[PDB]
Amino acid sequence: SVCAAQNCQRPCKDKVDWVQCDGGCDEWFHQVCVGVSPEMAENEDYICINCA
């Protein structure tokens, strides 16, 4: 699986956690690849590096 992060660490396993940018680009990222936790994912907004 590949996400939109600069260094998508190509997470290869069953069950992958994703998060989408609110900042505009509306692209998807592996939560691992952007270093965020599920709580941070569901409770608050995420602005990616390009949309920041």
């Binding site: 069950k15 956690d17 994703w18 998060v19 989408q20 609110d22 939560q31 994912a41 569901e42 608050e44």
Partner: peptide, 7 residues
């Protein structure tokens, strides 16, 4: 934000 889980 919007999250997703892929299996």
């Amino acid at each position: 934000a919007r999250t997703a889980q892929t299996a």
